[PDB]
PDB file of C-alpha atoms in Angstrom:
ATOM      1  CA  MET A   1       0.079   0.194  -0.022  1.00  0.00           C
ATOM      2  CA  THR A   2       1.641   3.306  -1.648  1.00  0.00           C
ATOM      3  CA  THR A   3      -1.419   5.604  -0.239  1.00  0.00           C
ATOM      4  CA  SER A   4      -1.274   7.501   3.317  1.00  0.00           C
ATOM      5  CA  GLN A   5      -3.264   6.219   6.325  1.00  0.00           C
ATOM      6  CA  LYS A   6      -5.182   9.533   5.668  1.00  0.00           C
ATOM      7  CA  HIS A   7      -6.246   8.908   2.148  1.00  0.00           C
ATOM      8  CA  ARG A   8      -7.320   5.336   3.694  1.00  0.00           C
ATOM      9  CA  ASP A   9      -9.000   6.389   6.910  1.00  0.00           C
ATOM     10  CA  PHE A  10     -11.119   8.822   3.945  1.00  0.00           C
ATOM     11  CA  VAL A  11     -11.957   6.007   1.595  1.00  0.00           C
ATOM     12  CA  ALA A  12     -12.566   3.330   4.752  1.00  0.00           C
ATOM     13  CA  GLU A  13     -16.292   4.996   4.809  1.00  0.00           C
ATOM     14  CA  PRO A  14     -18.947   7.203   3.766  1.00  0.00           C
ATOM     15  CA  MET A  15     -17.675  10.976   4.541  1.00  0.00           C
ATOM     16  CA  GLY A  16     -20.767  12.676   5.575  1.00  0.00           C
ATOM     17  CA  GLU A  17     -20.259  15.652   7.194  1.00  0.00           C
ATOM     18  CA  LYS A  18     -16.536  15.512   6.906  1.00  0.00           C
ATOM     19  CA  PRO A  19     -14.498  18.740   6.593  1.00  0.00           C
ATOM     20  CA  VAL A  20     -12.483  19.227   3.432  1.00  0.00           C
ATOM     21  CA  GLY A  21      -9.319  18.599   5.528  1.00  0.00           C
ATOM     22  CA  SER A  22     -10.030  15.021   6.048  1.00  0.00           C
ATOM     23  CA  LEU A  23      -8.766  14.805   2.077  1.00  0.00           C
ATOM     24  CA  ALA A  24      -5.988  13.072   1.350  1.00  0.00           C
ATOM     25  CA  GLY A  25      -3.472  15.977   0.214  1.00  0.00           C
ATOM     26  CA  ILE A  26      -5.248  19.038   1.825  1.00  0.00           C
ATOM     27  CA  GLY A  27      -3.169  20.111   4.601  1.00  0.00           C
ATOM     28  CA  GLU A  28      -4.440  23.136   7.170  1.00  0.00           C
ATOM     29  CA  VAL A  29      -3.111  25.613   4.732  1.00  0.00           C
ATOM     30  CA  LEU A  30      -5.241  24.284   1.479  1.00  0.00           C
ATOM     31  CA  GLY A  31      -8.095  23.554   3.624  1.00  0.00           C
ATOM     32  CA  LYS A  32      -8.265  27.029   4.593  1.00  0.00           C
ATOM     33  CA  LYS A  33      -7.965  28.463   0.938  1.00  0.00           C
ATOM     34  CA  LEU A  34     -10.866  25.865   0.100  1.00  0.00           C
ATOM     35  CA  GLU A  35     -12.840  26.829   3.476  1.00  0.00           C
ATOM     36  CA  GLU A  36     -13.025  30.529   2.496  1.00  0.00           C
ATOM     37  CA  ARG A  37     -13.524  29.901  -1.461  1.00  0.00           C
ATOM     38  CA  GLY A  38     -16.611  28.237  -0.021  1.00  0.00           C
ATOM     39  CA  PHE A  39     -15.800  24.607   0.035  1.00  0.00           C
ATOM     40  CA  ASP A  40     -15.749  24.013   3.535  1.00  0.00           C
ATOM     41  CA  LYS A  41     -17.035  20.298   3.480  1.00  0.00           C
ATOM     42  CA  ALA A  42     -15.267  17.295   1.718  1.00  0.00           C
ATOM     43  CA  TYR A  43     -18.729  16.186  -0.057  1.00  0.00           C
ATOM     44  CA  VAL A  44     -18.409  19.966  -1.493  1.00  0.00           C
ATOM     45  CA  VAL A  45     -15.446  18.924  -3.404  1.00  0.00           C
ATOM     46  CA  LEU A  46     -16.406  15.656  -4.149  1.00  0.00           C
ATOM     47  CA  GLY A  47     -19.658  17.745  -6.125  1.00  0.00           C
ATOM     48  CA  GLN A  48     -16.914  19.917  -8.125  1.00  0.00           C
ATOM     49  CA  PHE A  49     -15.071  16.164  -8.569  1.00  0.00           C
ATOM     50  CA  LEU A  50     -18.584  15.153  -9.863  1.00  0.00           C
ATOM     51  CA  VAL A  51     -20.032  17.803 -12.048  1.00  0.00           C
ATOM     52  CA  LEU A  52     -16.209  17.423 -13.609  1.00  0.00           C
ATOM     53  CA  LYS A  53     -16.898  14.150 -14.805  1.00  0.00           C
ATOM     54  CA  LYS A  54     -13.981  12.622 -12.605  1.00  0.00           C
ATOM     55  CA  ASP A  55     -11.598  13.833 -15.489  1.00  0.00           C
ATOM     56  CA  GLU A  56      -8.153  14.059 -13.576  1.00  0.00           C
ATOM     57  CA  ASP A  57      -6.939  16.977 -15.724  1.00  0.00           C
ATOM     58  CA  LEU A  58      -9.922  19.219 -15.090  1.00  0.00           C
ATOM     59  CA  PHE A  59     -10.497  18.837 -11.508  1.00  0.00           C
ATOM     60  CA  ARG A  60      -6.223  18.681 -10.914  1.00  0.00           C
ATOM     61  CA  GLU A  61      -6.214  21.956 -12.377  1.00  0.00           C
ATOM     62  CA  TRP A  62      -9.462  23.386 -10.886  1.00  0.00           C
ATOM     63  CA  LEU A  63      -7.917  22.453  -7.194  1.00  0.00           C
ATOM     64  CA  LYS A  64      -4.716  24.833  -8.296  1.00  0.00           C
ATOM     65  CA  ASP A  65      -6.390  27.892  -9.199  1.00  0.00           C
ATOM     66  CA  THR A  66      -8.763  27.611  -6.784  1.00  0.00           C
ATOM     67  CA  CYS A  67      -6.366  27.067  -3.500  1.00  0.00           C
ATOM     68  CA  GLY A  68      -3.282  26.669  -4.773  1.00  0.00           C
ATOM     69  CA  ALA A  69      -2.420  23.123  -4.518  1.00  0.00           C
ATOM     70  CA  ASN A  70       0.702  21.762  -6.397  1.00  0.00           C
ATOM     71  CA  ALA A  71       1.136  18.439  -8.084  1.00  0.00           C
ATOM     72  CA  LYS A  72       1.576  15.868  -5.445  1.00  0.00           C
ATOM     73  CA  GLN A  73      -1.397  17.612  -3.570  1.00  0.00           C
ATOM     74  CA  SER A  74      -3.972  17.760  -6.451  1.00  0.00           C
ATOM     75  CA  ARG A  75      -2.849  13.864  -7.389  1.00  0.00           C
ATOM     76  CA  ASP A  76      -3.526  12.510  -3.457  1.00  0.00           C
ATOM     77  CA  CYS A  77      -6.726  14.744  -3.639  1.00  0.00           C
ATOM     78  CA  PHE A  78      -7.893  13.006  -7.178  1.00  0.00           C
ATOM     79  CA  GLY A  79      -6.688   9.796  -5.912  1.00  0.00           C
ATOM     80  CA  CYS A  80      -8.791  10.007  -2.650  1.00  0.00           C
ATOM     81  CA  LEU A  81     -11.824  11.162  -4.067  1.00  0.00           C
ATOM     82  CA  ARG A  82     -11.311   8.404  -7.195  1.00  0.00           C
ATOM     83  CA  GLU A  83     -11.244   5.589  -4.699  1.00  0.00           C
ATOM     84  CA  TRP A  84     -13.988   7.163  -2.418  1.00  0.00           C
ATOM     85  CA  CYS A  85     -16.409   6.863  -5.463  1.00  0.00           C
ATOM     86  CA  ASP A  86     -15.338   3.234  -6.582  1.00  0.00           C
ATOM     87  CA  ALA A  87     -16.230   2.393  -2.991  1.00  0.00           C
ATOM     88  CA  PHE A  88     -19.609   4.391  -2.370  1.00  0.00           C
ATOM     89  CA  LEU A  89     -20.873   5.699  -5.780  1.00  0.00           C
TER      90      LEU A  89
ATOM     91  CA  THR B   1     -45.544   9.777  -1.370  1.00  0.00           C
ATOM     92  CA  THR B   2     -43.004   8.934  -3.369  1.00  0.00           C
ATOM     93  CA  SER B   3     -42.966   7.452  -6.911  1.00  0.00           C
ATOM     94  CA  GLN B   4     -41.348   3.788  -7.333  1.00  0.00           C
ATOM     95  CA  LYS B   5     -38.411   5.482  -9.210  1.00  0.00           C
ATOM     96  CA  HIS B   6     -37.922   7.812  -6.410  1.00  0.00           C
ATOM     97  CA  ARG B   7     -37.277   4.444  -4.220  1.00  0.00           C
ATOM     98  CA  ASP B   8     -35.371   2.401  -6.424  1.00  0.00           C
ATOM     99  CA  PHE B   9     -33.208   5.453  -7.010  1.00  0.00           C
ATOM    100  CA  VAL B  10     -32.506   6.090  -2.943  1.00  0.00           C
ATOM    101  CA  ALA B  11     -32.311   2.321  -2.304  1.00  0.00           C
ATOM    102  CA  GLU B  12     -28.572   1.406  -3.635  1.00  0.00           C
ATOM    103  CA  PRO B  13     -25.536   3.408  -4.893  1.00  0.00           C
ATOM    104  CA  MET B  14     -26.132   5.177  -8.229  1.00  0.00           C
ATOM    105  CA  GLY B  15     -22.748   4.362 -10.116  1.00  0.00           C
ATOM    106  CA  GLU B  16     -23.255   4.978 -13.681  1.00  0.00           C
ATOM    107  CA  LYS B  17     -27.292   5.301 -14.026  1.00  0.00           C
ATOM    108  CA  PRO B  18     -28.057   7.934 -16.515  1.00  0.00           C
ATOM    109  CA  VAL B  19     -29.580  11.198 -15.566  1.00  0.00           C
ATOM    110  CA  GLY B  20     -33.270   9.460 -16.642  1.00  0.00           C
ATOM    111  CA  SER B  21     -32.835   7.268 -13.433  1.00  0.00           C
ATOM    112  CA  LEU B  22     -33.471  10.446 -11.390  1.00  0.00           C
ATOM    113  CA  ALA B  23     -37.253  11.134  -9.879  1.00  0.00           C
ATOM    114  CA  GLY B  24     -38.407  13.601 -11.637  1.00  0.00           C
ATOM    115  CA  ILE B  25     -36.479  13.266 -14.951  1.00  0.00           C
ATOM    116  CA  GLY B  26     -37.918  12.025 -17.527  1.00  0.00           C
ATOM    117  CA  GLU B  27     -37.370  11.673 -21.437  1.00  0.00           C
ATOM    118  CA  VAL B  28     -37.563  15.141 -22.602  1.00  0.00           C
ATOM    119  CA  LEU B  29     -35.641  16.856 -19.433  1.00  0.00           C
ATOM    120  CA  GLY B  30     -32.985  14.074 -19.820  1.00  0.00           C
ATOM    121  CA  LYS B  31     -32.204  14.974 -23.217  1.00  0.00           C
ATOM    122  CA  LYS B  32     -31.860  18.550 -22.293  1.00  0.00           C
ATOM    123  CA  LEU B  33     -29.755  17.678 -19.102  1.00  0.00           C
ATOM    124  CA  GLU B  34     -27.654  14.891 -21.949  1.00  0.00           C
ATOM    125  CA  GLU B  35     -27.225  18.413 -24.013  1.00  0.00           C
ATOM    126  CA  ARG B  36     -25.449  20.724 -21.529  1.00  0.00           C
ATOM    127  CA  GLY B  37     -23.345  17.719 -20.511  1.00  0.00           C
ATOM    128  CA  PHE B  38     -25.263  16.431 -17.443  1.00  0.00           C
ATOM    129  CA  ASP B  39     -25.365  12.816 -19.423  1.00  0.00           C
ATOM    130  CA  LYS B  40     -25.240  10.697 -15.705  1.00  0.00           C
ATOM    131  CA  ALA B  41     -26.801  10.784 -12.498  1.00  0.00           C
ATOM    132  CA  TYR B  42     -23.753  11.894 -10.046  1.00  0.00           C
ATOM    133  CA  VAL B  43     -22.980  14.920 -12.644  1.00  0.00           C
ATOM    134  CA  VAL B  44     -26.391  16.022 -11.272  1.00  0.00           C
ATOM    135  CA  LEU B  45     -25.341  14.804  -7.581  1.00  0.00           C
ATOM    136  CA  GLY B  46     -22.245  16.796  -8.663  1.00  0.00           C
ATOM    137  CA  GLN B  47     -24.550  20.264  -8.732  1.00  0.00           C
ATOM    138  CA  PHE B  48     -26.493  18.918  -5.594  1.00  0.00           C
ATOM    139  CA  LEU B  49     -23.178  18.655  -3.993  1.00  0.00           C
ATOM    140  CA  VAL B  50     -21.446  22.129  -4.754  1.00  0.00           C
ATOM    141  CA  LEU B  51     -24.555  24.138  -4.215  1.00  0.00           C
ATOM    142  CA  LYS B  52     -24.012  22.539  -0.922  1.00  0.00           C
ATOM    143  CA  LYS B  53     -27.720  21.068  -0.916  1.00  0.00           C
ATOM    144  CA  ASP B  54     -29.552  24.258  -1.087  1.00  0.00           C
ATOM    145  CA  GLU B  55     -33.310  23.381  -2.129  1.00  0.00           C
ATOM    146  CA  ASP B  56     -34.064  26.590  -3.460  1.00  0.00           C
ATOM    147  CA  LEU B  57     -30.852  26.801  -4.902  1.00  0.00           C
ATOM    148  CA  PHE B  58     -30.456  23.208  -6.803  1.00  0.00           C
ATOM    149  CA  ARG B  59     -34.479  23.874  -7.732  1.00  0.00           C
ATOM    150  CA  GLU B  60     -33.745  27.248  -9.530  1.00  0.00           C
ATOM    151  CA  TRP B  61     -30.698  25.872 -11.459  1.00  0.00           C
ATOM    152  CA  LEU B  62     -32.404  22.682 -12.394  1.00  0.00           C
ATOM    153  CA  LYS B  63     -35.150  24.865 -14.032  1.00  0.00           C
ATOM    154  CA  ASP B  64     -33.090  27.167 -16.017  1.00  0.00           C
ATOM    155  CA  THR B  65     -30.716  24.408 -16.957  1.00  0.00           C
ATOM    156  CA  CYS B  66     -33.302  21.749 -18.365  1.00  0.00           C
ATOM    157  CA  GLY B  67     -36.503  23.817 -17.995  1.00  0.00           C
ATOM    158  CA  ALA B  68     -38.087  21.643 -14.979  1.00  0.00           C
ATOM    159  CA  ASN B  69     -41.345  22.420 -13.269  1.00  0.00           C
ATOM    160  CA  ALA B  70     -42.160  22.625  -9.963  1.00  0.00           C
ATOM    161  CA  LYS B  71     -43.125  19.367  -9.945  1.00  0.00           C
ATOM    162  CA  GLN B  72     -40.176  17.665 -11.407  1.00  0.00           C
ATOM    163  CA  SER B  73     -37.563  19.557  -9.310  1.00  0.00           C
ATOM    164  CA  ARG B  74     -39.102  18.999  -6.432  1.00  0.00           C
ATOM    165  CA  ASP B  75     -38.951  14.991  -7.013  1.00  0.00           C
ATOM    166  CA  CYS B  76     -35.206  15.489  -8.263  1.00  0.00           C
ATOM    167  CA  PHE B  77     -34.197  17.183  -5.077  1.00  0.00           C
ATOM    168  CA  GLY B  78     -36.129  15.033  -3.109  1.00  0.00           C
ATOM    169  CA  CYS B  79     -34.558  11.749  -4.579  1.00  0.00           C
ATOM    170  CA  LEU B  80     -30.817  13.132  -4.597  1.00  0.00           C
ATOM    171  CA  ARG B  81     -31.438  14.212  -0.689  1.00  0.00           C
ATOM    172  CA  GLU B  82     -32.413  10.781   0.118  1.00  0.00           C
ATOM    173  CA  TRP B  83     -29.724   9.205  -1.297  1.00  0.00           C
ATOM    174  CA  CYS B  84     -27.014  11.412   0.553  1.00  0.00           C
ATOM    175  CA  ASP B  85     -29.126  10.689   3.423  1.00  0.00           C
ATOM    176  CA  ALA B  86     -28.166   7.138   2.876  1.00  0.00           C
ATOM    177  CA  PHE B  87     -24.995   6.912   1.209  1.00  0.00           C
ATOM    178  CA  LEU B  88     -22.836  10.025   1.416  1.00  0.00           C
TER     179      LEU B  88
END
């Protein structure tokens, strides 16, 4: 298993009302920037992932433009949403 | 009161179900939703979630996007709300 424990914690269960910082790759700095843009719960970011039809390029660019995430952060956040979706959607 | 279409949708994960599986989304609305890129049910779920599950704003967005009437938008919102309570 190459993923972080944080990714595994997130994909193991429905997300409910978890904050955005529960997503892999979303540390406190990115999380604050997301929350002040309205993306305060993990499910709101999931929403954007889904409206972008799960496209990696579009979603990772969106995250970069919205909170300044770097390549590793956006990869981790995308992969964590992708696997959550495969498990629960 | 609800339709069997609603209950069937809220009973299980939606996976790749087409947009026409949503309660309220008939053949006419579905086509218009597909034309605008909302071809699968989960894309409409996505919009519901980006709008933080706000009933008024989601139902208005649906009217603006595919022309849904009050009952169609009621039915569609309600089935996404109950699906989310079960699975999200």
